[PDB]
Amino acid sequence: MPPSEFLDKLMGKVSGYDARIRPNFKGPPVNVTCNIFINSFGSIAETTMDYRVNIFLRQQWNDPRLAYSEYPDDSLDLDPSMLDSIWKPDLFFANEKGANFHEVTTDNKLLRISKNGNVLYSIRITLVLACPMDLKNFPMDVQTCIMQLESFGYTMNDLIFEWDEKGAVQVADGLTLPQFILKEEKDLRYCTKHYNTGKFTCIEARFHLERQMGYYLIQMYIPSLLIVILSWVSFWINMDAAPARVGLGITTVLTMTTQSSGSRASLPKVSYVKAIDIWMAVCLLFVFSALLEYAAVNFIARQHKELLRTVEEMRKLFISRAKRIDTVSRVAFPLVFLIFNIFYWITYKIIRSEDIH
Amino acid sequence: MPPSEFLDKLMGKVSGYDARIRPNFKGPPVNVTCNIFINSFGSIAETTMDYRVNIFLRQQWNDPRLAYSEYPDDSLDLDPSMLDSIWKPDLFFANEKGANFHEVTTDNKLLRISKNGNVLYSIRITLVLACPMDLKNFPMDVQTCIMQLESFGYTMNDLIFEWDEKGAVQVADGLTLPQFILKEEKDLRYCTKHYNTGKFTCIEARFHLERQMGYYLIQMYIPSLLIVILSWVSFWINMDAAPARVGLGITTVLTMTTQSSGSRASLPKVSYVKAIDIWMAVCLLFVFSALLEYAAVNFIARQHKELLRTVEEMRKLFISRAKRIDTVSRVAFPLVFLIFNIFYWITYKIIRSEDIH
Amino acid sequence: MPPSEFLDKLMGKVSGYDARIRPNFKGPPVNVTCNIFINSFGSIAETTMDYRVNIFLRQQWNDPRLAYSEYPDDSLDLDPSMLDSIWKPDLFFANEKGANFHEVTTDNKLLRISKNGNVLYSIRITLVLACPMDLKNFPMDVQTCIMQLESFGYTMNDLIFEWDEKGAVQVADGLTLPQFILKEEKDLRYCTKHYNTGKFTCIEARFHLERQMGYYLIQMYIPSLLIVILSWVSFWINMDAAPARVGLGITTVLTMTTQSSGSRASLPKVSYVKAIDIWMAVCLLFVFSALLEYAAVNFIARQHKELLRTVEEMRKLFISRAKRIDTVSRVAFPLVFLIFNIFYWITYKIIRSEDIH
Amino acid sequence: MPPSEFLDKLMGKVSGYDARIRPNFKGPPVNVTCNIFINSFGSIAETTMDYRVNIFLRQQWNDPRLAYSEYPDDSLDLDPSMLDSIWKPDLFFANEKGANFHEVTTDNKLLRISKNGNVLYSIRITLVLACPMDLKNFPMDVQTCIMQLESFGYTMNDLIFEWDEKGAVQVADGLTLPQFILKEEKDLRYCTKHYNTGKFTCIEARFHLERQMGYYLIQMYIPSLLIVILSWVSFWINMDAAPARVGLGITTVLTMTTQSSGSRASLPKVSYVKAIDIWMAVCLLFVFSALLEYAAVNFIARQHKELLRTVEEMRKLFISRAKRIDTVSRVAFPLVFLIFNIFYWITYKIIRSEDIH
Amino acid sequence: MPPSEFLDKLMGKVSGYDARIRPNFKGPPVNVTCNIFINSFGSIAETTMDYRVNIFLRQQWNDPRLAYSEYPDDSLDLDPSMLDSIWKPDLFFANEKGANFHEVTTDNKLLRISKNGNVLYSIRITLVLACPMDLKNFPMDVQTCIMQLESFGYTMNDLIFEWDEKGAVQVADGLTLPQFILKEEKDLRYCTKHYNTGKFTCIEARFHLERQMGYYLIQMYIPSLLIVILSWVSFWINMDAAPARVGLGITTVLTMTTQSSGSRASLPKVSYVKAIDIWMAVCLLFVFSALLEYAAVNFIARQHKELLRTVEEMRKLFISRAKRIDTVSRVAFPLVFLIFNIFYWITYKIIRSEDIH
Ligand SMILES: *[C@@H]1O[C@H](CO)[C@@H](O)[C@H](O)[C@H]1NC(C)=O
Ligand SMILES: *[C@@H]1O[C@H](CO)[C@@H](O)[C@H](O)[C@H]1NC(C)=O
Ligand SMILES: *[C@@H]1O[C@H](CO)[C@@H](O)[C@H](O)[C@H]1NC(C)=O
Ligand SMILES: *[C@@H]1O[C@H](CO)[C@@H](O)[C@H](O)[C@H]1NC(C)=O
Ligand SMILES: *[C@@H]1O[C@H](CO)[C@@H](O)[C@H](O)[C@H]1NC(C)=O
């Protein structure tokens, strides 16, 4: 048998196959199973609020026509340039940006057809998809990003979309993300869409992402704690009558606030307060208090000098006050810092532990 | 009855349907009702002066032709690939940038046809639209952004555009903006367009936006007020003969002006003065006055030392002057700041309250 | 009469109308009048050297064919999808970047035809056009930007382009630019183009733009004058034996030069010197002179101390010298600044006044 | 013989050549040899994780049809506009971004055909290809970048891809990269792909790149070592009772940490620690220790002054302690730096030497 | 005679003109002369390594067919929409980026045909072309940029490309570049290309560019020399026992190195050292030496004070040493700077003078 005669007899002009009519017309809705393969997950960002993904869409449906049963083989791998003479279903994504097809040398398309009429359609597409992430806890967080597949032009009475029981979502081997860790859970549920025109089918897929804490610690947690260390026992040791001691303190306050301004650069503008903001505010409070304490001891020493110019006994009293304040501080401040850090770290670890459940 | 015979008999070559002629030719103008659904409002910006929106346009009109009345059903959901054989009306937006169609797998289009001849056309399009915002009050403001739909090629005698009485503008459930809050008012009015060629129909839709005050306070209001706090009682306490006191003051003036330069980065260049500029200018005036007062007390002390090298009585007079000036300042400055902030905040709250009405 | 018969009889296959031949072949050149409407002027920039404009091109010409005279009406508004079966003239812009057409829902096109044969063609196009601006005077300047319309493929013997006597250039009502003020002059002249292939017709339109002085004053003129004020009477008052006085002066010199570097950011690199550069250089000269004068008084005081360790009479002489220098400076410097500013401002106002004529 | 008759008789409508059927149908798989020529390697970057390449793909296969043997010549150079009437194989790249064809004036295509049936297909294409580089050692590293060629729609039973034994990968003469040095090794191996649909052929090509150390030394290694030099013997020489000495040290710590923040700008965010981070951390440790030592000597001197206000013998003891500490440091610090640099440089040279093997 | 009959009789279906066969088939190669007109040279940059140019390509060749000799005129200006029915030659550029055609209203194309068969083809195209510039001497340099035209699909036996003897390269009148000066030399030579497939013709055009020295002097040469001036006689005059003198020097070193980092921003990363780097390194060496000298005099003064607490004679010796060192320096440093600048400037002027030849 010649191949040409079968290919034009099956789906051509001599056949009564109209490509504008759905299979099982005036009948039960056409069921469609959808299988997705993830080739390369990438380009997650915060300011734009979207990520990039390159998928391999695969959808199967049945046709009562296109049942040959004359060749002795089971399936046929047809050419992909005659995909315009069959009934492809419509499918779009609600959060759709970009989405251009890949057509290098030959169109990246695939067609298969079985003896009973089961078809197999495979398309390669790169999707820019919008994820509305919530940055309540900025350094430690889990983000859920949504993919939606739905029918633009048909109602529920036609083209019901179903998931696949086995291997619904697959990932390419050895795929890694520099910033996030993907979780192997991939919970699947479907939510219908209601409009004034009608009610339309939809299916949804969810991915869970965990941010890596490694980078953030080195850029922000360690240098801020260094600036704090540079104030803990660097000027308290120094002599009370020093211009430089106040200079040291002012410069430390200045550069740490400049770092605090530096931290909020990539982040999109939001009303609510992030965890990193809390940490920077507390560190700024300690370094500002350092100058405060200096002002206090300088004012007490000024009274001592003013009366100095019974007086010796009062002079002794005033210097003794100075010594008590400085030593008391030199041991008072470390513990409050310690109590803070332990409280902050334990509360953030337990809130992620509760949220993940 | 076969479907193919009806579809080509109705709108094909055997039918006298010319797709280049308007319905009701040499007759009353074709009325068109327009319904819009907002899928995703996003990407509002100031420098470029425009925003991004993804809509679901829907327009209905009547045709005296395309009245079948032979099938027993009421409406028909046709294929969307034969939308080139009917009379679509022309429609464009005056503030048009971008506006490319979404064609993933299948064109996102919809066609319906009733027994009398009422059609239903639905198109998905992403629009970049120019909004000429007025930044008279930068942190607290309400912005009105305009959408215009008008006919490029037909005059008033044809294609009059009407709004829909019920559900003219709809919004997707759970839609939020990070920076702005959308108001559920959506006032609709239509303004005709006059040209030398002729007079053309148009309809307009208005959206009201409220900016969130939360982010701006933390980035700018609180640190500037911190710098001010760092000058209020940090160097006044310190001893009069100090090089560091003037160093402290100079550095505070320097970094606050650098912050003032930093604030105007995203903003487009404008001639008029914003509210945030007023606040930064007043804060700069206070910190500059701090140095002023230092220069004054230093000059008085220099006269005291110069004569010091009746003289004691004049020496006492000069130091007494020094003490009066410093203490007087230490209580004089807080109130003026307080009177300022209360005046500024109450006037901006009442101007927004008057403007919103 | 049916519409279909007239539309295909007039400009179809039964008609001997070849769309590849110009009207009045082997005859006098086809005259063309061009009318332009400006919808939205925007995006003027300096670094890229170009601006963006959205126009409504309109061109009219006569045809000896396409003269019907059988319907009783005067003109006909035809469909815009059959603009490929007539003789459109070629037209391009010499400074052409971008220039893509707007095709939302339906192509933005317009066709009209009169009884004698006068046609009317209207096209909406967004143009990126290159303007070679001269920044000899940067804050105060007038810029002339050029639009050129010319024929690529025909010589002078065909397609002569003419302007329209009345309403040649129109602007949309209530159109404003944030940075520039447009002038209602719009002088029109035409310059022919000569090439080795032949001589080709062209027409030119000129727009005059005035930059707003409001923004530039607040960002640059006022803070630099503030830094200068911060040196005029802040350290001269202070005691001669002060480390801080020189610190004050050095910091002021440093930050003003950093501001001078900051000013030249948007500007494209150019060999010649702008006015703003002159102002910044003069301010830098004053603040550098401030330190100079300090070095002088410190050296004189050092000689006084060195001999101090007849001597009293010489000691008195040296301190008297110190006082003369400082007081003389305290009144000498203001006038030279005043003479400068009055000279600079009057010369720039009179040069713009002479240039505008 | 006329050329037209041969060209349409060979591959036209009178010929039974169907372009939708593979050669040797129901037969052994079609073998394909692939030869690549690299025109211009460029645009390697780290943040985006991809590079740009412009290649000349060349693939040869045999056909049992298209064997003429009637003209007396061996090969024919056909027109490249009739490449749609033959059986091109499908080919795509797994890491595919961009990949648009070059079509200036005429499509950049090439066709040749021999007497036996061997064809020659040449295509010019610019590829954006993703390379997942590992930055374990940032300044000194070797990066391997992967190119993959595979069949989208055919299984192993058809279209097996083979490399070419001679001249598989060629490079244009005099091709250089500003940042990297290409290695003339180009190891070639092939890895098959397994999917649920089937098993598909693939071939892989690897390129080795060496980063140049010249630029990194001048921007980062030399200035940091300068800051370190500016602390080694600049303040140790200075008098113990100096405010400036601590000022010097604080400023050096501040600017070096600002440089450390500056270094990580181009780099993508990663959890693991790079070599440059180790070097900057160690330098920061030395400059922080400098202030530490100052605090120590100041505290010892304060005890000396406090008791100073047997006492002389204890006063001598305390100053002697001061001298021992300072001189000991002045010779103690250089060696540890020397031991460090020699250890760091030798370990990085030997790890690259081991890795390259 | 009707025009339609001649246009379809000459190059249509009744004519035996096959557009897929080269003229003079099985004959001597088709000679082609190429003339280029430069409309607008622009956008030269360093980081990307490429420039932008808008040209008017013009190529002439002869055909033995298309010789009419029946109309009485010499040449014909045909329509440019029938350029698909003739034998255009293939032509591409080796360093090809972008290269999209300009199609505003009508395609920018031109066709002419003479009586003997000489055709004239004109195309407007904007080219992004890669220039591999060598930055050995960054502020003063001459750059040569290459344009290559070559045949993709034909060997030497066909389509030999020749230049035009008169007016090969033309430039539009009044064309200027902001940064570079174009030289009116334009040397033309041709280099053949050898490949494994065959040997292919090519022709090359070279442009010489001179960078303007005006901008670079004001941004970098003058302020660095200012910082140097701010160290020459500002602190040497000041008293030896001053904390501020060392503060002055440290700040000058700091800001100049920050400027040195600032200078290398636009520049692409390169291993070799530019001239500007040499100048900045030498200036940094002088300002670092300034602090060095301070450390020296402070150490000598410390010995003087230590012994001070025969001794007077040694005290005199030590102060005399101090005076000798300072005065000697005050006259020693200017000359070495002078010798440097004269050496550097004369060597760079003579190397450009030798290179240009
Ligand atoms: C699709 O599945 C539903 C539920 O199993 C079924 O009722 C319906 O008949 C199916 N459609 C077919 C078989 O066309
Ligand atoms: C459209 O509406 C107007 C106003 O109601 C009416 O006058 C006109 O006849 C309508 N057009 C029709 C029915 O075609
Ligand atoms: C166009 O105008 C010129 C000048 O008025 C005239 O000489 C020429 O005949 C006109 N062309 C026509 C009428 O076709
Ligand atoms: C391709 O090569 C394989 C291995 O050499 C061989 O078995 C097969 O027959 C070849 N295919 C042909 C000749 O079509
Ligand atoms: C092209 O020029 C060469 C050299 O002048 C000549 O040999 C060849 O015959 C020419 N080709 C023609 C005339 O077709």
Residue numbers in the entry:
A (entry chain D), B (entry chain E), C (entry chain A), D (entry chain C), E (entry chain B): 32 to 340, 395 to 442
The study reports:
Glycinergic neurotransmission across motor and sensory neurons in the brainstem and spinal cord is mediated by glycine receptors (GlyR) where, in addition to pain perception, they play a key role in respiration, motor coordination, and muscle tone. GlyRs share a conserved architecture as other members of pLGIC, with each subunit consisting of an extracellular domain (ECD)- a twisted β-sheet of ten strands, a transmembrane domain (TMD)- a four α-helical bundle, and an intracellular domain (ICD)- a primarily unstructured region between the third and fourth TM helices. Binding of glycine in the ECD triggers a conformational change across the three domains, leading to channel opening and then eventually desensitization, involving distinct gates within the TMD. Here we investigate the molecular details of THC-GlyR interactions, and probe the conformational rearrangements underlying allosteric potentiation by THC, using single particle cryo-electron microscopy (Cryo-EM) analysis of zebrafish homomeric GlyRα1 (referred to as GlyR) reconstituted in lipid-nanodiscs.
In the GlyR-0.1gly-THC reconstruction, a lipid-like density is observed in an inter-subunit groove wedged between M3 and M4, and in close proximity to Ser320 (position Ser324 in human GlyRα1, previously shown to be critical for human GlyRα1 and GlyRα3 potentiation by cannabinoids). We modeled the density as THC, oriented such that the methyl groups of the C10 monoterpene moiety face the hydrophobic groove lined by the Phe418 and Val421 sidechains on M4 and Phe317 on M3. The opposite side of the monoterpene ring has the aromatic hydroxyl group that is oriented toward Ser320 (corresponding to Ser324 in human GlyRα1). This orientation is conducive to forming a hydrogen bond interaction between the aromatic hydroxyl group and Ser320 sidechain. The n-pentyl tail points downward and engages in a hydrophobic interaction with Ile410 and Val328 on M4 and M3, respectively. An alignment of GlyR-0.1gly and GlyR-0.1gly-THC structures reveals local structural changes in the mid-region of M4 and M3 helices involving residues Phe418, Ser320, and Phe317, and the intracellular ends of M1 and M2. The outward orientation of the M1-M2 linker moves Pro-2′ away from the pore axis, leading to the widening of the pore at the location of the desensitization gate. Interestingly, at Pro-2′, the pore is less constricted in the GlyR-0.1gly-THC when gauged from the pore radii and the Cα position. The GlyR-0.1gly-THC is selective for anions with no Na+ ions permeating through the Pro-2′ selectivity filter region. By counting the number of permeation events under these conditions of membrane potential and ionic concentration, we estimate a single-channel conductance (corrected to 150 mM NaCl) of 23 ± 1 pS for the GlyR-0.1gly-THC state.
